[PDB]
Copies of this chain bind each other. A is one copy, B any other.
Amino acid sequence: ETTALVCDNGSGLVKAGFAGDDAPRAVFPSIVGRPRHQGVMVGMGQKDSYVGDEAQSKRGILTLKYPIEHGIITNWDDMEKIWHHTFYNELRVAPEEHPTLLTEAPLNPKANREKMTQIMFETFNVPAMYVAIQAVLSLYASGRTTGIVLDSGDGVTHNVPIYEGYALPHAIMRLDLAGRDLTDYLMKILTERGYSFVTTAEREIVRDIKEKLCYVALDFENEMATAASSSSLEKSYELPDGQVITIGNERFRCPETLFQPSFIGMESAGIHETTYNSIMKCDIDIRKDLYANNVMSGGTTMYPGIADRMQKEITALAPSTMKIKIIAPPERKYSVWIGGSILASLSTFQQMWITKQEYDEAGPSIVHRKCF
């Protein structure tokens, strides 16, 4: 095929474009927004739903919903709006002409992948499609055939060990804590300095505070003490409406939830201990090359100082007789998409698409025998 789509149908943000390009043609919020107020002006574009950057622009009059929660599509009537928008509004393709790579977290419900397959063949009529694991696509962007990938988006953090191009599915870890839970935790702790952000539209203002100002502190208890001898670690943000909020230790106490999940009251290992536990579930001879090829992917891996702390923490867990290396590239915000754009372009991948002809003789249950 000349061109195929790769759609990274992520939680919170969707990345889309053509296989063989080096970056997404489109990136926009994975949001559908609906009016919450009385419409009074006739003779106007009174539209019953907005999606992506349209919903983000009009958000003061909208309730904003994400159809994807924790990497699982929880609203299919609105996920069809996000895929319709993706194909017809800023890729501006005919889906009937282009096969599509699609993207999923490990350990998802099987019904998610089946219903994602059924919609692509029966609503969008694609020639062929395939659903790929986000952490396998991250090694394609990095150019590896071995590494443990820590992929962390808006809804899920997951670890996938790979060695010599074989995955270890018994050692895959999933953690329902990534960018949305950090945004919600920042809304919670910003209340303690006096700022109430409570609506779905204000949740997007706090996501921008988090992205602009938050960081991961190399030693948290020393940083907490450094912020008690105050004013040096503080920054300020200017809200829509032009009011300013000053922000202090909540600037690094927020991303620490990744390393201390008990801040959001959940009982789990932190992301450093989840990467270590996943390496220690692997066969002993591969562990040396996994510690040396520790790949980071996805937007929740974009905090300043997170790779320095991930190296510090895996180095304290692992035996000191060997070298941990953290491979967090500057474009890792898109490595799942870039690696899907590599996979969908390979000549040896063109045999692996599920085709329309192969779906309509096997039903949506085809997707489990033909995809990892």
Using CB atoms and an 8 Å cutoff, list the residues of chain A in contact with chain B: 35-44, 46, 58-61, 63, 72, 107-111, 133, 136, 139-140, 145, 162-171, 174, 176, 188, 191-194, 196, 198-202, 205, 238-244, 262, 264-268, 281-288, 318-322, 343, 346-349, 352, 372
Contacts and interface: CB of A to CB of B under 8 A. Distances in A.
Given A36-B262, A201-B284, 16 more contacts: A39-B166, A40-B165, A41-B139, A41-B165, A42-B348, A43-B347, A46-B165, A61-B163, A109-B191, A109-B194, A110-B193, A198-B266, A199-B283, A239-B284, A240-B285, A241-B319
Nearest to A135: B40
A281 B37 CA distance: 13
A60 B166 CA distance: 10
A61 B283 contact: yes
Contact of A372 (B40, B198, B262, B282): B40
Given A242-B322, A319-B241, A322-B242, A40 B167 contact: yes
A156 to B, nearest CB: 11
Contact of A162 (B41, B46, B168, B169): B41
Nearest 6 Cβ contacts at the A-B interface: A170-B265, A60-B285, A41-B165, A242-B321, A60-B286, A242-B322
* Interface SS of chain A: loop
A38 B166 contact: yes
A198 B267 CA distance: 8
A200 B267 contact: yes
A196 to B, nearest CB: 7
Contacts of A164: 58, 61
Contacts of A243: 319, 321
Contacts of A43: 343, 346-349
Contact of A109 (B133, B192, B321): B192
Contacts of A242: 288, 318-322
A60 B36 CA distance: 38
Most buried by B among A174, A199, A283: A283
Given A41-B139, A201-B284, A267 B162 contact: no
B163 A60 contact: yes
14 contacts: A37-B167, A40-B162, A40-B165, A42-B346, A61-B286, A107-B192, A111-B193, A168-B265, A176-B196, A205-B284, A240-B285, A241-B284, A241-B285, A242-B318
Given A107-B192, A165-B46, A194-B111, A201 B285 contact: yes
Most buried by B among A72, A191, A244: A191
Nearest to A37: B166
B268 A198 contact: yes
B145 A372 contact: no
A240 B60 contact: no
A32 B201 CA distance: 36
A62 B319 CA distance: 25
A252 to B, nearest CB: 17
A288 B241 contact: yes
A198 B176 contact: yes
A239 B166 CA distance: 22
A322 B239 CA distance: 11
A38 B321 contact: no
Nearest to A36: B267
Nearest to A368: B192
